[PDB]
Enzyme design. Structure first.
Site, PDB file in Angstrom:
ATOM      1  N   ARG A  51       0.747  -1.333   0.263  1.00 40.50           N
ATOM      2  CA  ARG A  51      -0.068  -0.134  -0.171  1.00 40.50           C
ATOM      3  C   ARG A  51       0.869   1.004   0.363  1.00 40.50           C
ATOM      4  O   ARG A  51       1.854   1.519   0.316  1.00 40.50           O
ATOM      5  CB  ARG A  51      -0.703  -0.125   0.946  1.00 40.50           C
ATOM      6  CG  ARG A  51      -1.850  -1.449   1.457  1.00 40.50           C
ATOM      7  CD  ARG A  51      -2.643  -1.229   2.860  1.00 40.50           C
ATOM      8  NE  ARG A  51      -3.740  -2.075   2.907  1.00 40.50           N
ATOM      9  CZ  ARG A  51      -3.398  -3.792   2.585  1.00 40.50           C
ATOM     10  NH1 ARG A  51      -2.088  -4.112   2.640  1.00 40.50           N
ATOM     11  NH2 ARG A  51      -4.132  -4.160   3.197  1.00 40.50           N
ATOM     12  N   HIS A  54       0.370   2.808   4.786  1.00 40.95           N
ATOM     13  CA  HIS A  54      -0.173   2.269   5.800  1.00 40.95           C
ATOM     14  C   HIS A  54      -0.001   0.871   5.340  1.00 40.95           C
ATOM     15  O   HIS A  54      -0.800  -0.235   5.308  1.00 40.95           O
ATOM     16  CB  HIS A  54      -1.838   2.503   6.006  1.00 40.95           C
ATOM     17  CG  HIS A  54      -2.588   3.677   6.329  1.00 40.95           C
ATOM     18  ND1 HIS A  54      -2.994   3.867   7.916  1.00 40.95           N
ATOM     19  CD2 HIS A  54      -2.351   4.646   6.052  1.00 40.95           C
ATOM     20  CE1 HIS A  54      -3.136   5.162   8.156  1.00 40.95           C
ATOM     21  NE2 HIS A  54      -2.861   5.594   7.025  1.00 40.95           N
ATOM     22  N   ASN A 127      -8.656   6.519  11.895  1.00 35.74           N
ATOM     23  CA  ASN A 127      -6.975   6.846  12.151  1.00 35.74           C
ATOM     24  C   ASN A 127      -7.191   6.713  13.768  1.00 35.74           C
ATOM     25  O   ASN A 127      -8.262   6.750  14.375  1.00 35.74           O
ATOM     26  CB  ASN A 127      -6.563   7.968  11.583  1.00 35.74           C
ATOM     27  CG  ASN A 127      -5.663   7.561  10.471  1.00 35.74           C
ATOM     28  OD1 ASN A 127      -5.331   6.652  10.275  1.00 35.74           O
ATOM     29  ND2 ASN A 127      -5.078   9.116   9.688  1.00 35.74           N
ATOM     30  N   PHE A 140      -2.213  15.736  -0.205  1.00 38.05           N
ATOM     31  CA  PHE A 140      -1.804  14.516   0.714  1.00 38.05           C
ATOM     32  C   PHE A 140      -0.275  13.834  -0.116  1.00 38.05           C
ATOM     33  O   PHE A 140       0.799  13.559   0.569  1.00 38.05           O
ATOM     34  CB  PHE A 140      -2.933  12.890   0.082  1.00 38.05           C
ATOM     35  CG  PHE A 140      -2.803  11.846   1.067  1.00 38.05           C
ATOM     36  CD1 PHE A 140      -3.001  12.330   2.306  1.00 38.05           C
ATOM     37  CD2 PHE A 140      -2.276  10.947   0.725  1.00 38.05           C
ATOM     38  CE1 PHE A 140      -2.931  11.549   3.585  1.00 38.05           C
ATOM     39  CE2 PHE A 140      -2.408   9.663   1.406  1.00 38.05           C
ATOM     40  CZ  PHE A 140      -2.096   9.577   2.645  1.00 38.05           C
ATOM     41  N   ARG A 337     -10.429  12.059  -0.802  1.00 39.15           N
ATOM     42  CA  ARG A 337     -10.295  10.649  -0.688  1.00 39.15           C
ATOM     43  C   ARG A 337     -10.699   9.251  -1.189  1.00 39.15           C
ATOM     44  O   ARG A 337     -10.799   8.122  -2.035  1.00 39.15           O
ATOM     45  CB  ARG A 337     -10.884  10.097   0.996  1.00 39.15           C
ATOM     46  CG  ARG A 337      -9.671  10.805   2.100  1.00 39.15           C
ATOM     47  CD  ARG A 337      -9.819  10.659   3.110  1.00 39.15           C
ATOM     48  NE  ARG A 337      -9.717   9.388   3.340  1.00 39.15           N
ATOM     49  CZ  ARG A 337      -9.785   8.702   4.650  1.00 39.15           C
ATOM     50  NH1 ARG A 337     -11.084   9.355   5.045  1.00 39.15           N
ATOM     51  NH2 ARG A 337      -9.770   7.293   5.261  1.00 39.15           N
ATOM     52  N   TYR A 341      -9.521   5.359  -3.734  1.00 40.12           N
ATOM     53  CA  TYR A 341      -9.063   4.133  -2.597  1.00 40.12           C
ATOM     54  C   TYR A 341      -9.507   3.114  -4.053  1.00 40.12           C
ATOM     55  O   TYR A 341      -9.563   2.134  -3.745  1.00 40.12           O
ATOM     56  CB  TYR A 341     -10.052   3.868  -1.473  1.00 40.12           C
ATOM     57  CG  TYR A 341      -9.447   4.455  -0.068  1.00 40.12           C
ATOM     58  CD1 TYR A 341     -10.011   6.564  -0.115  1.00 40.12           C
ATOM     59  CD2 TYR A 341      -8.891   4.092   0.673  1.00 40.12           C
ATOM     60  CE1 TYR A 341      -9.465   7.007   0.704  1.00 40.12           C
ATOM     61  CE2 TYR A 341      -8.327   4.734   1.660  1.00 40.12           C
ATOM     62  CZ  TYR A 341      -8.465   6.367   1.945  1.00 40.12           C
ATOM     63  OH  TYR A 341      -8.226   6.888   3.201  1.00 40.12           O
TER      64      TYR A 341
HETATM   65  C1  HDD Z   1      -7.028  10.474  -1.396  1.00 37.15           C
HETATM   66  C2  HDD Z   1      -5.868  10.672  -0.978  1.00 37.15           C
HETATM   67  C3  HDD Z   1      -5.768  10.191   0.858  1.00 37.15           C
HETATM   68  C4  HDD Z   1      -6.129  11.075   1.629  1.00 37.15           C
HETATM   69  C5  HDD Z   1      -6.013  13.144   1.568  1.00 37.15           C
HETATM   70  C6  HDD Z   1      -6.667   9.391   2.512  1.00 37.15           C
HETATM   71  N1  HDD Z   1      -6.033   8.693   2.311  1.00 37.15           N
HETATM   72 FE1  HDD Z   1      -6.046   7.077   3.545  1.00 37.15          FE
HETATM   73  N2  HDD Z   1      -5.024   5.971   1.871  1.00 37.15           N
HETATM   74  C7  HDD Z   1      -5.008   6.687   0.446  1.00 37.15           C
HETATM   75  C8  HDD Z   1      -5.547   7.812   0.342  1.00 37.15           C
HETATM   76  C9  HDD Z   1      -6.121   8.882   1.100  1.00 37.15           C
HETATM   77  C10 HDD Z   1      -4.517   5.237  -0.130  1.00 37.15           C
HETATM   78  C11 HDD Z   1      -3.427   5.709  -1.104  1.00 37.15           C
HETATM   79  O1  HDD Z   1      -5.307   5.399  -1.670  1.00 37.15           O
HETATM   80  C12 HDD Z   1      -4.476   4.070   0.050  1.00 37.15           C
HETATM   81  C13 HDD Z   1      -2.963   3.384   0.756  1.00 37.15           C
HETATM   82  C14 HDD Z   1      -3.268   1.942  -0.379  1.00 37.15           C
HETATM   83  C15 HDD Z   1      -4.959   2.045  -0.394  1.00 37.15           C
HETATM   84  O2  HDD Z   1      -5.717   0.594  -0.538  1.00 37.15           O
HETATM   85  O3  HDD Z   1      -6.085   2.996  -0.165  1.00 37.15           O
HETATM   86  C16 HDD Z   1      -5.030   4.350   1.648  1.00 37.15           C
HETATM   87  C17 HDD Z   1      -5.220   3.495   2.659  1.00 37.15           C
HETATM   88  C18 HDD Z   1      -5.422   4.082   4.206  1.00 37.15           C
HETATM   89  C19 HDD Z   1      -5.419   3.355   5.288  1.00 37.15           C
HETATM   90  C20 HDD Z   1      -5.477   1.623   5.249  1.00 37.15           C
HETATM   91  C21 HDD Z   1      -6.340   0.698   4.557  1.00 37.15           C
HETATM   92  C22 HDD Z   1      -5.822  -0.132   4.813  1.00 37.15           C
HETATM   93  O4  HDD Z   1      -5.236  -0.942   6.060  1.00 37.15           O
HETATM   94  O5  HDD Z   1      -5.907  -0.769   4.183  1.00 37.15           O
HETATM   95  C23 HDD Z   1      -6.161   4.355   6.511  1.00 37.15           C
HETATM   96  C24 HDD Z   1      -6.508   3.480   7.524  1.00 37.15           C
HETATM   97  C25 HDD Z   1      -5.954   5.702   5.924  1.00 37.15           C
HETATM   98  N3  HDD Z   1      -5.846   5.916   4.627  1.00 37.15           N
HETATM   99  C26 HDD Z   1      -7.182   6.544   6.505  1.00 37.15           C
HETATM  100  C27 HDD Z   1      -7.049   7.610   6.323  1.00 37.15           C
HETATM  101  C28 HDD Z   1      -7.336   9.432   7.097  1.00 37.15           C
HETATM  102  C29 HDD Z   1      -8.570   8.783   8.746  1.00 37.15           C
HETATM  103  C30 HDD Z   1      -7.813   9.542   6.544  1.00 37.15           C
HETATM  104  C31 HDD Z   1      -7.259  11.488   6.337  1.00 37.15           C
HETATM  105  C32 HDD Z   1      -9.165  11.574   6.789  1.00 37.15           C
HETATM  106  C33 HDD Z   1      -6.990   9.726   5.136  1.00 37.15           C
HETATM  107  N4  HDD Z   1      -6.976   8.323   5.062  1.00 37.15           N
HETATM  108  C34 HDD Z   1      -6.367  10.703   4.633  1.00 37.15           C
END
Ligand code: HDD
Ligand code: HDD
Ligand code: HDD
Lengths: 698, 698, 520
Positions: A51, A54, A127, A140, A337, A341
């Site tokens: 990933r 995370h 989180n 981000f 967000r 995903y």
């Molecule tokens: C637009 C982009 C973006 C933004 C603004 C955030 N994230 Fe995110 N997050 C991602 C883009 C991302 C991602 C790049 O799409 C990920 C990693 C690869 C995946 O599957 O999802 C991810 C995974 C990911 C995971 C792991 C899920 C797992 O265990 O697979 C968690 C817990 C969060 N995020 C939590 C958050 C929180 C609490 C945020 C703030 C409110 C946050 N993210 C903002």
């Protein structure tokens, strides 16, 4: 069961490639061999991209159930049906580190829950901290790139302790509130089972009448919120990088299923603009003194995965995954967000990721989405579009459960900007710091001191010292003397001193006094007192704690009475960092041997330095007293139980010594009671507040 | 059943993106919309890479069963168990064309069979021609690149008719035998159900006593081997690019399951070197007059796929897939093939391709191959390697069915070379040409003439004319006058004139006289004779053939007696190229209308030119006679049935005309009998041998 | 320089998505925004699969040069031209851990060198230990799966200290020699700049007369071979997981370019079968008292990467990469390796991985290999096959530098088996232990004690204690009292006490007394 190729052909050996060979001369391997090539090919392609954030995480299966219907806020059955239990899978994680990085680093922790409801999959991707570094998703990549290893040399791993991270923190004031949380004990939890979870972004709930509410989701641990201390966290990162993964797996395997209470903060559609801050600003919390958290459900994790890779590694969550009755808000962080995903899964897993067992919903899936790489689903029929002459796969009406899209009013202009209230960036950072207890403020101070020490650029830590003045003038001065730079004497962002509830970890104790799942080391050597040993061992077990016997060797240790036991580990194979507390039974011969064992003395000094409960009886009392060598720490001299800074002792053991009731409470009478109470308190902070840890070498 | 997202959430519409909108003004679409983004994302990623070769193909499910045990040659149950039926999936294909290229191009045809045996998957990946262009697998990229569209402009599609193909043919003499087969009617089959199949490479069979035999596998159609004529094949390539795909699907849907006899040629281990050619040379056939084909089984295709993409497009075959009792030989073409079918799947499908439903074996699969992208299999357990302390997944002994690796003796040096007998490259090319019937030789001549005409470089066709002299001096001269160049008067590779059996298609007639599955057009117009129409229609159906009514319009056509019928197609929507024969009933008004219809006249002239059976009664006789306008083609003048060059007529229909028995045989008495016999013969070659087709414009 | 999209369009801000907004009310983000979607899309897809083994690593650029021509052994210019300098890139690594795992764990260390010669790319993919766990490549998945995190819970990370690892070690006696090296200080080096490198497998060299020699390649650090102590290594794994990566980068940045002497052990074609062990058995070293190491060159690393991901992360090595004058042997471990380094790149990088800057050779590349995903090379012409009428891209004769395939004689039967001498599995394990200095033996004892302590299954450590008796009876007894089990009193594999040179780290001091690069 016999060895076969992936295409079902049984094989006679898994040890030799097909080659040209003779009794005395070996020859070349043959290209024709399909069994060998398949073995190596499967091996060669085992890995998939980690990933992007995370990457390091651990998960488990469980169940969720509301005990109080929230039908007044939503018509989503998962939150209104008090008779059904909803299966879930939860993955916890760090953020910055890659796959093999350590569990106990300082970082935000991911808390992602996939609800397999009868109405589809609902993911609450949260989180363990309620706010975030930025307000707009577009940045981000900036904050993540800044925190991740620097591009030229890929240093440092899973650490915010470097130039670029703090460069961004200073230059992007929206992040002020967040880095304050990042330096608090919240970022170094003792266990994934002992931390909160937050949706962070503002979501929405729609009820049967079509009325909407803006909401914040909360997860609160029944074991309470507890953290490690820095020196300990760093040692564990190396001594046991799987500390949290093992902690979770072990608890579940032992039947100690971790539980969290599920709560909701709700603001009526009509009161959206009634606060000083924008309720859709993810850098802001909704003070619980203004908007209370309403707890309505409970979730427990009760089953470990069957195989880590296909389940924990391949599970995919997304904020886009919402069920009817739950929706999105114009939160500018959440908005971006939703896009991410889905997009990222294309390269990480593949377009058909929703077909993977762990990702599939438990209800019927019907649509005209087709093909894509590694397609398992086979659909009979001659039509794959809508509308069609057979009216195949028609839409669901609202009454049939079709997703309700709230007809939100929208008015403005197309522009790259945020509204007025988003401009406030310092108030809550001050509020958070103000709300921290003395020990928590000290830990944050130590954090800033360590982090900025690791910033090589004087411009980076120099500027940060200036920024700290916008949170608290005293804080800036203290950090300045620790890492360099010049703390300003004034600020354009005065800290008015207001505090608020439910921010300090002191406001999140366990549901009830307990030591459940805690690990207690019982240190012995030849000649130990079998009596104190037996009493403690049984009491630890009977209180759902884990007794771990540590001796000079892991073969056999003989008690003073001739009985023997095989320790779980020897003194060199383990360290006090791996347990919650230590207990040392008496036995003159044992105490003497341990008093001359440097490793053993370190176990005691480190446990003390890390603020952990220490218990000793008989001759072990003098062992501990002398190992610590602090006049401030008093010990028992007679047959009376004595407690000093979380150090519980009893020098003269009598028949009644281990017959007192074991009551985990303040001012218990018996030895085990007071010892367990010290353990239940997690750590003795007075030890640190009085600078005693600073006097010990560990 | 209602519309949902891939994650199970019901939706109210599949027609609108979530946007900002008002009654009179439309606004921008929203990024938050997960339903819409998922729809487009799934669509955006539907495609996977096409197969690098054999990209265009069609398949079906079926069953295989031996009626005679080959236990003397092998101990593989699939070839010895006469009581069990083995499920199979067969995919037929062309070679050079990409996915949307036409079915009826001139090209080798793939004939791949996956046997889902109880002992694992066994794939027999063959072609409809017994030999290949090269002897060593290392040159596959060369011959394929040469035949494929030229690199600079990607021209031409699915055709060997261009410079590079013939450049390689001339320069690589190993390919001489092959391009001779390529120019024969074998390369333009009438139906995938009417062609042979060959393993091509030399495989091996091992029996219960451990004795080995070198073998060649054969598939022989019970419907016989039949082909199209060039002008027709080209028109179909455009008029119906799915001609073969539809032919196969239709036959199976109609209950006419195509069948093939399975045969084996075997040479004892001891007689490996007893032939003029190397029995492991894939550019050589094993003359059946020297090594007879022993037929022992039958395979039938009886079920079309449920969905093309997940089944036909994703199925993966490989020569590496062999079951116990079947093995490989040192055939230098086969040796490299084994490497390729596993390798290519990594990018075409994915490393876990064996997990796809269509590829999975029907027996237990047990091994320690793990992970890989899009992994569905979940394996419980703490061990994934051998040997291990639980002795989990141990190898199978030979008695338990473990694969038997023949201990073949090998001696020589490491070098990039082939042995002596591989150096012979012309003998069998001559043998093949010599064995062809007169009509087959004429068709090959026409093929070389067309192919070389399409070669722009005088050096390319000029050299090929020289090469043809190494096959037959007369052939070279004829081609030279057709395409240019100078045919040599002498050759260093004299053609001695020997011929052999079972090469000419004339030696592969249907198991029994039949017209099963053949399509017969019944051409009508207002005023047609309902009597002849009814008789023919019933007889066609009763003989398992397909009657297709073609009229001036596809709404309603009225018979002379007032009855009506709705044709299947009108004259402009179909062409004679799409059917096996045409029949035109009488009716003065109908014959007059058709005689003035250019399209109708073309149907007759084209059917004649393509050598198809033509039947007519009453006034239609004069229609046909005048449409063809050839004195050589005589027709009935009275109430007697008349046949001339496959043109069957009856001018004066009497009560007894359609009461004669319908006997599909030479010299039948009735009209339908003689007409059906002409159809059963497939085409009238005398028509072409006497140059009558050359006199018609079609 | 101003901010632009990947398609060259300048942007006014990198802080806001295009949305509907007003002074007092924020609205939804717009789908139309190409700048924002591109930013997030590029971010979303930054990662590629980590290497299945040796995922954690650090590299740098440098140069190699022979100071003594080995023309008597090979005609490969890279080993005979004493006037030219050959550019190289070297990647060091651990084996079991994933990408973010620590540098200072106990593990074998990878030492991979890519030689960008004028005659093509030659890769010497070695390790910092001269032997391996297995004799046949087919078992690589077994030993790697056993050492890697256990499948059910993915524990433990980058550690051999667990049940499955020691389960395999005991059950596969071929690995005895290897796990002895694994428990020595060699597995916890103080610096990547202070360890040896070995080709491990037996390769071959062919000279101008066509004569062949079987060889072993060696890299010897001029700073000497030095190691950490366990407690320190574990603390560093947490306190500074980038300890080795930083150590290498810092030294190079400060101008302290690490150097290694390059040596070759050679056995004439005719003496292949003159030893007690099979010279093609990768679980065996060639005692230097029998076959001396001939040093002929030197390599130094003098330039850190410009950007880690496109260079260090994307570089691909393979044993298949050999230049004329250098070849393969029938070493059953090497034979399977050749297959793997090409295959794995298909999913890790992509079929066109040889086009990546870091992987491209520095000499002309001419062939008819075409297309494939992310193809950058554009080739003009109407022909793409051989033979062709323009005689385009003809083969090179031997005199023109064409690769020389040694015409090795081969005779036997097709079978899944190894020859007689491969059956010996204990002699060298004893030799190695015997050759260790007292302090090194103590460190190995401490290692076995720690590792087996971390094995929860009594059957696992119990069996290992029994196996240790086949190396040294005294060793077994000591470990038994430390971790449990019962040390046997006898063994069918007596240790005769012989020792050999150049195994103990004490025999590898710095070229001269120094404290260069040390931190005080
Ligand atoms: C637009 C982009 C973006 C933004 C603004 C955030 N994230 Fe995110 N997050 C991602 C883009 C991302 C991602 C790049 O799409 C990920 C990693 C690869 C995946 O599957 O999802 C991810 C995974 C990911 C995971 C792991 C899920 C797992 O265990 O697979 C968690 C817990 C969060 N995020 C939590 C958050 C929180 C609490 C945020 C703030 C409110 C946050 N993210 C903002
Ligand atoms: C070493 C390379 C090589 C060689 C020498 C050949 N082929 Fe091949 N063939 C492939 C490499 C290949 C391939 C590139 O691996 C393909 C296409 C993609 C795939 O799945 O398999 C394939 C597919 C393929 C198919 C299609 C299976 C399907 O329907 O998916 C058939 C029928 C054959 N081949 C037949 C043959 C015959 C009769 C050959 C000569 C004896 C032959 N091939 C030589
Ligand atoms: C047949 C399988 C196999 C076998 C028997 C070995 N390896 Fe290997 N190795 C691989 C299969 C592999 C691989 C799976 O193909 C890898 C990881 C991904 C990659 O690019 O190459 C690799 C990478 C890899 C690297 C890392 C190159 C880099 O930095 O990218 C080194 C140093 C070695 N290997 C060293 C060895 C040594 C000294 C071996 C014993 C003589 C050995 N390997 C046996």
């Amino acid at each position: 069961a016999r060895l076969t190729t992936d295409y079902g052909v049984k094989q006679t050996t898994a040890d030799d490639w097909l080659r040209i060979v003779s009794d005395d001369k070996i020859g070349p391997s043959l290209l024709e061999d399909p069994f060998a090539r398949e073995r190596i090919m499967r091996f060669d392609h085992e890995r998939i991209p980690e990933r992007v954030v995370h990457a390091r995480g651990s998960g488990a299966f469980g169940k969720f159930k509301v005990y109080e219907s929230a039908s007044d806020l939503t018509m989503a059955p998962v939150l209104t049906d008090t008779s059904r239990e909803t299966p879930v899978f939860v993955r916890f994680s760090t953020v910055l580190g890659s796959r093999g990085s350590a569990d106990t680093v300082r970082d935000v922790r991911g808390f992602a829950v996939k609800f397999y409801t009868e109405e589809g999959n609902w993911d609450l991707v949260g989180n363990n901290i309620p706010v975030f570094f930025i307000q707009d998703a577009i940045k981000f990549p900036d904050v993540i790139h800044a925190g991740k290893p620097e591009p030229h040399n890929e240093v440092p791993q899973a650490q915010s302790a470097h130039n670029n991270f703090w460069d961004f923190q200073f230059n992007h004031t929206e992040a002020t509130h967040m880095f304050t949380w990042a330096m608090s004990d919240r970022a170094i939890p003792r266990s994934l089972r002992m931390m909160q979870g937050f949706g962070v972004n503002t979501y929405t709930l729609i009820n049967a009448q079509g009325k909407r509410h803006f909401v914040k989701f909360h997860w609160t641990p029944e074991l309470g919120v507890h953290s490690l201390v820095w020196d300990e966290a760093l040692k564990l990162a190396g001594q046991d990088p799987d500390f949290h993964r093992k902690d979770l797996w072990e608890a579940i395997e032992n039947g100690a299923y971790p539980k969290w209470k599920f709560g909701i903060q709700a603001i009526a559609e009509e009161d959206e603009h009634k606060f000083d801050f924008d309720i859709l600003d993810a850098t802001k919390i909704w003070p619980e003194d203004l908007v209370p958290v309403r707890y309505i459900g409970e979730m427990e994790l009760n089953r470990n995965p069957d195989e880590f890779f296909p389940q924990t590694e391949q599970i995919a969550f997304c904020t886009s995954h919402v069920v009817n009755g739950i929706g999105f808000s114009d939160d500018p962080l959440l908005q971006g967000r939703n896009f991410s995903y889905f997009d990222t899964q294309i390269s990480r897993l593949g377009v058909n990721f929703q077909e993977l067992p762990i990702n599939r919903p438990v209800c019927p899936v019907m649509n005209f989405n087709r093909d894509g790489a590694m397609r398992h689903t086979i659909s009979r029929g001659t039509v794959n579009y809508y509308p069609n002459r057979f009216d195949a796969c028609p839409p669901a009406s609202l009454k049939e459960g079709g997703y309700l899209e709230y007809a939100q009013k929208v008015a403005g202009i197309k522009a790259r900007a945020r509204s007025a209230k988003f401009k406030e960036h310092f108030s809550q950072a001050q509020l958070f710091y103000n709300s921290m207890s003395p020990i928590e403020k000290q830990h944050m101070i130590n954090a800033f001191g360590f982090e900025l020490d690791h910033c090589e650029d004087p411009v980076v830590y120099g500027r940060m010292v200036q920024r700290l003045a916008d949170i608290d003038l005293g804080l800036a001065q203290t950090i300045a003397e620790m890492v360099g730079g010049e703390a300003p004497t004034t600020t354009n962002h005065p800290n008015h001193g207001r505090k608020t509830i439910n921010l300090s970890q002191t406001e999140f104790p366990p549901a009830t006094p307990t030591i459940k799942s805690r690990r207690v080391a019982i240190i012995i050597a030849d000649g130990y007192d079998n009596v104190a040993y037996d009493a403690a061992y049984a009491a630890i077990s009977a209180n759902q704690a884990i007794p771990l016997v540590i001796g000079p060797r892991r073969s056999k240790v003989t008690a003073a009475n001739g009985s023997t036991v095989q320790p779980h580990h020897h003194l060199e194979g383990f360290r006090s960092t791996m347990v919650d507390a230590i207990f040392i039974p008496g036995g003159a011969k044992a105490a003497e041997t341990l008093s001359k064992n440097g490793r053993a003395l370190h176990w005691i000094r480190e446990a003390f330095g890390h603020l952990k409960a220490i218990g000793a009886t008989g001759e072990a009392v003098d062992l501990v007293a002398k190992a610590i060598a602090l006049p401030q720490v008093t010990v028992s001299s007679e047959a009376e139980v004595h407690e000093s800074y979380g150090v519980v002792t009893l020098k003269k053991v009598k028949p009644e010594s281990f017959t007192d009731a074991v009551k985990i409470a303040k001012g218990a009478a018996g030895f085990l009671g007071e010892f367990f109470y010290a353990i239940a308190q997690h750590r003795n902070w007075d030890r640190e507040l009085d600078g005693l840890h600073s006097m010990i070498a560990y």
